[PDB]
Amino acid sequence: IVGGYTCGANTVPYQVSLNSGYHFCGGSLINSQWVVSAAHCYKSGIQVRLGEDNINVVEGNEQFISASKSIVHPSYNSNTLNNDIMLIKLKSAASLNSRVASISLPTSCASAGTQCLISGWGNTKSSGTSYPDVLKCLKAPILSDSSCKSAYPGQITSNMFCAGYLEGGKDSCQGDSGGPVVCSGKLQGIVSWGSGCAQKNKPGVYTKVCNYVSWIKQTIASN
Ligand SMILES: [Ca+2]
Ligand SMILES: [Mg+2]
Ligand SMILES: [Zn+2]
Numbered sequence: 472i473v474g475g476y477t478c479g480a481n482t483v484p485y486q487v488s489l490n491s492g493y494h495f496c497g498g499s500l501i502n503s504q505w506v507v508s509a510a511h512c513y514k515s516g517i518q519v520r521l522g523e524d525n526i527n528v529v530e531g532n533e534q535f536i537s538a539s540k541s542i543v544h545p546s547y548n549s550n551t552l553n554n555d556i557m558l559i560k561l562k563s564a565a566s567l568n569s570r571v572a573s574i575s576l577p578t579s580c581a582s583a584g585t586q587c588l589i590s591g592w593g594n595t596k597s598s599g600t601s602y603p604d605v606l607k608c609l610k611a612p613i614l615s616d617s618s619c620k621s622a623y624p625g626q627i628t629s630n631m632f633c634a635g636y637l638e639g640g641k642d643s644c645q646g647d648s649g650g651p652v653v654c655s656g657k658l659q660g661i662v663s664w665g666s667g668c669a670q671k672n673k674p675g676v677y678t679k680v681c682n683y684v685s686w687i688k689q690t691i692a693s694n
Contacts, residue, residue, distance in 0.1 A: 472589065473597050473669040474641035475609035480524035481532060483590040483606060485574035485658075486651060488520040489559070490535075497591045497650030499658050500573045503564040505691050506538075508649035509661050509678060510547040510557040517541065519561060522570040526592055527604045532570045536561045542690055544683070553628045555663045555678045558690055576688075577657040580681035583615040587634055587654035589675075591662065593646025597639070597669040602646060609643070611635045613654065614674055622672050630682050632660060635674035643675040644668035652677050 487498040487506050496512030498519065506519055522532035539562040544554040565571055581587070589609045595601045611634045619633030627633075634652060635642050643650065643662040652660030660677030667673060 472591055472593055472607035472609045472647055473595055473644050475595070475607040478590055478606045478608040480530070481522060481570035483588070483608065483651070484570055484572035486523070486590050486606060488523050488526055488592060489649060490518045490520050491516045494526045494592055494646070496648050497662065498559065499651040500565065500571065501576060501658070501687070502573050502691070503567060504561050506559040506561065507658070507661065507687065508557055508559060509555045509663055510543040511549060511552060511555055511663070512649040513541060513543050513557055517559060519559065521565050524606055525604045534565050534571060536563055536565060538562065540694065542694065544686070551626065551628070552664050554630055556661055556680070556683055558687065560694060574651065574653055574658045575656060576684050577659055577681045580679065581613055581654045581659045583613050585613045585654045586610055587613060587652045587659060589634070589643050589647070589650065589652050589662065591643060591647030591650040593648070594644040594668060597667065609641055611641060619674065619676070622674060623666070623676065627676065630679050631663065631676050632679050633674040633676055634660065637672050637674060639669045639671035639673070642669035
């Protein structure tokens, strides 16, 4: 996350870190047994770490649970990143508490202008590489589709939306992929892609979760 702040230990209780020997992506806990992340974060051998603040220090509030199965969306296109969403089931149910809570799925889609909270342990430099060990947060608004599409001509689909600042300066970055974009108490997006980080007129692009609620609900109930 570039131009963001340190969230605070366990202030984004639904935030998860996907680990395969090291942190490689973020995710969101939707209930005691399931996590939603981005399909381009699919790996074999995932351990989910909940209650994390510093990913390099076990401070007492963590739960490290291995995944039993992963389901990438049926229509995921790794070339265009369309339908970039995946569900991960936990081998054991997590214990929800103050530090580990699930986030609600949306009932409707959010409007341009809505302020959201984006979080993750990704790179914090646009021009440079600095990986933080504690969770970073960023408040950013949803941009109108017209400004999202002008920035990425022929690349945005109905399953994506942009959020951020066209002036640049603030944005999600690599290492944040799969993480949450929460607006008005609902999970509205998943960190998917962007052009470099925090560049002017290059906002980040997010998977539009309101379009997959039925798929999520049906898939988790049958697995
Ligand atoms: Ca820790
Ligand atoms: Mg981006
Ligand atoms: Zn990525």
